């Protein structure tokens, strides 16, 4: 166990920046949590180990892909001048945690009161409201999350063309992934947190500005992270408050073990499909900018091999909840029926 | 509540037999259980109330159907002489409870040790072994349960033709039921018990000789009776020992309420599909003879009406367990996956 407490190195020693510009960050900028973590590997695109982790659907930080090299010059001023006049979704929160919720599922749970509110805005309005909160020492927090579409300026389109499509397109092909579905632009304030959740798509997480601490958990820790019901607005998100974990309701969160890393400008983090991930912008680190690359996952293989992988059971559990909500005619009857199936029978 | 304790009349006063032959039975012949019961209605075939109970799939004892009138002369001697030389399944038990188990499902649960053993035998061998146990004051118990097939003697075939097919065929048609699948002949010793279970078929339960106490529970008490897992050999049977109920494992058995009656020669009990039923041959009442009529249930209606009836949810729960056992590739993984879906999520 002595070697275990040491193997839980977190993100390791902060990287030292070229030109002797000091540590990119310090441990004090990271929030404190209850669980141990390991470092995610930081490797080169050409390192065969990095290739072995991606094909095996394990996370890895790639340091030299140049995936978004043209975008590393992006700041609020540059984007305000060239990202066009399209509408940008901007969530507002009283807290540092920006829990994702699906608006379309809010009807099923009318008792659910979100603490993040979405608001369409022009990017210059976001920079303005961003500047106001700063100038007034306000505790309000903002987090821009917008899919990049046709309504972006020419130079932003030229930056896009300058992405390393040769590299990522080859990755898409070698893993059999589906189409690229979107690129989510992410501009958040220091201290912002996206609580733990998993996505049903493969993700290349390309950091542009600022630093983000990424804590991942493999799909086989489903039992420890307690996602919301599938029909709940917070489907795929963890119910556990990482800041105040309730071990009475979530006892197995005391067995969670994460994979952790801090990405900075130029880093690309492969967040494999179904992998949980907790994203937080370093405290007192300024704004963070990121662009992700969401790809549909490979199809289900013709022949199924047993035993099933953890992510396959997650797919099964999700589908069970879905069709029961469909068959019962009401999502809120899924819980009672399942309990009826279990109590005194399987527990 | 005063009127409730009185409304739980059990099987009511024992019937008095024609010709002043005394009470057909006395309360002391009935085993004692922990739950209250109501009387099932005893009505005439021509009573419109009886028609309303069958169409609404509620139990009812019909007193004058003549469904098996030619079979009311049946005894061990008559059957031994005319039921042919076919093989007859005869379960043997150290106890009065003859819990049904599916032999084909015993592979999935190799830790399951049945206490009833099936044995193919000629009917004269059954009468012989029956006579031996008596002559030796043995505690062994037998229960013949055999589907009636082509290998029965001519007179037994003539008795069959003499059944009131006009009446039951009309019932089959007016309820939209499927085909008649089988007629199970049942010859058991006094005190024999078939513990609580439900069948996926409609059943007309035609008593021939002796008396049987039938305790039924509607499908909406699924939560109180705790069937075994679908893949367990005792699928569709209750896990609760009615003689020693374990309220720690089966807490809701303290809310069970049954419908009860004692049928005798000439009575026909409609046991609706999915309805639980506990069958016991009256103590010190001699052998019992019964022939049931199992019909496939009506198809699923084109348009589904919500809310779903209890039996529809039972159909859903059964199918969920089935496809999970199929998808997971192992029945014994159904429990863990369901618990994973529930704990901290729906409970």
């Amino acid at each position: 166990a002595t070697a275990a407490e040491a193997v839980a190195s977190g993100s390791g020693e902060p990287r030292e920046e070229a030109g002797a510009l000091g540590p990119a960050w310090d441990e004090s900028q990271l929030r404190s949590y209850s669980f141990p973590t390991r470092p995610i590997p930081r490797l080169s695109q050409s390192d065969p180990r990095a290739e072995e982790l991606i094909e095996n659907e394990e996370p890895v930080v790639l340091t030299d892909t140049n995936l978004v090299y043209p975008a590393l010059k992006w700041d609020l001023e540059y984007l305000q001048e060239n990202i066009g006049n399209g509408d940008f979704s901007v969530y507002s929160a009283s807290t540092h945690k920006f829990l994702y919720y699906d608006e379309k599922k809010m009807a099923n749970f009318q008792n659910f009161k979100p603490r993040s509110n979405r608001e369409e805005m022009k990017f210059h309005e976001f920079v303005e409201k961003l500047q106001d909160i700063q100038q007034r020492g306000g505790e309000e927090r903002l987090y821009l999350q917008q899919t990049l579409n046709d309504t972006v300026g020419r130079k932003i389109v030229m930056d896009f063309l300058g992405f390393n499509w040769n590299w990522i397109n080859k990755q898409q092909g070698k893993r059999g992934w589906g189409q690229l579905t979107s690129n989510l632009l992410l501009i958040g304030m220091e201290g912002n947190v996206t609580p733990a959740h998993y996505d049903e798509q493969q993700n290349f997480f390309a950091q542009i500005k600022g630093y983000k601490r990424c804590i991942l958990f493999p799909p086989d820790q489903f039992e420890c992270l307690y996602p919301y019901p599938v029909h709940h607005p917070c489907d795929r998100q963890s119910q556990v408050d990482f800041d105040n974990p309730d071990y009475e309701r979530f006892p197995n969160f005391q067995n969670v073990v994460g994979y952790e890393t801090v990405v900075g400008p130029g880093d690309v983090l492969y967040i494999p499909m179904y992998w949980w991930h907790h994203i937080e912008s370093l405290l007192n680190g300024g704004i963070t900018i990121t662009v992700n690359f969401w790809y549909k996952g490979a199809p289900t293989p013709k022949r199924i091999e047993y035993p099933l992988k953890a992510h396959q059971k997650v797919a099964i559990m999700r589908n069970i909840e879905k069709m029961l909500g469909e068959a019962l005619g009401n999502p809120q009857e899924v819980g009672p029926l399942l309990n009826t199936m279990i109590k005194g029978r399987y527990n | 509540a005063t009127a409730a304790e009185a409304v739980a009349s059990g099987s009511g006063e024992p019937r008095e037999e024609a010709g002043a032959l005394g009470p057909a039975w006395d309360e002391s012949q009935l085993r004692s259980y922990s739950f209250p019961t109501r009387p099932i209605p005893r009505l005439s075939q021509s009573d419109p109330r009886a028609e309303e109970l069958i169409e609404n799939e509620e139990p009812v004892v019909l007193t004058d159907t003549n469904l098996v009138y030619p079979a009311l002369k049946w005894d061990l001697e008559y059957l031994q002489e005319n039921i042919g030389n076919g093989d007859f399944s005869v379960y043997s038990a150290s106890t009065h409870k003859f819990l049904y188990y599916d032999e084909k499902k015993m592979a999935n649960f190799q830790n399951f040790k049945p206490r009833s053993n099936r044995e193919e035998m000629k009917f004269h061998e059954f009468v012989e072994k029956l006579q031996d146990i008596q002559q030796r004051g043995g505690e062994e118990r037998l229960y013949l349960q055999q589907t009636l097939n082509d290998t029965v003697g001519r007179k037994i075939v003539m008795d069959f033709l003499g059944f009131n097919w006009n009446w039951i065929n009309k019932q089959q048609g007016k309820r939209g039921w499927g085909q008649l699948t089988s007629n199970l002949l049942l010859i058991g010793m006094e005190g024999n018990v078939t513990p609580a279970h439900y069948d996926e078929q409609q059943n007309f339960f035609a008593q021939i000789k002796g008396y049987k106490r039938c305790i039924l529970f509607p499908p909406d008490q699924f939560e109180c009776l705790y069937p075994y897992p679908v893949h367990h050999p005792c699928d569709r049977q209750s896990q609760v020992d009615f003689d020693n109920p374990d309220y720690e494992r089966f807490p809701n058995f303290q809310n069970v309420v049954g419908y009860e009656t004692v049928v005798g020669p000439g009575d026909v009990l409609y046991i609706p599909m999915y309805w639980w039923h506990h069958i016991e041959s009256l103590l010190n009442g001699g052998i019992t003879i019964t022939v049931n009529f199992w019909y496939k249930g009506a198809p699923t209606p084109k348009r589904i009406e919500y809310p779903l009836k209890a039996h529809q949810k039972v159909a859903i729960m059964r199918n969920i367990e089935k496809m999970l056992g199929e998808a997971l590739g192992n029945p014994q993984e159904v429990g863990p996956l369901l618990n994973t879906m529930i704990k901290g999520r729906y409970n």
Binding site: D102, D199, E200, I304 | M323, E326, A327
Partner: peptide, 19 residues
Amino acid sequence: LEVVKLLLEAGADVNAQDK
């Protein structure tokens, strides 16, 4: 069709609100 394939089919939902 195949019950196993029906239950194994993955979705494609991500943390991006749909319009």
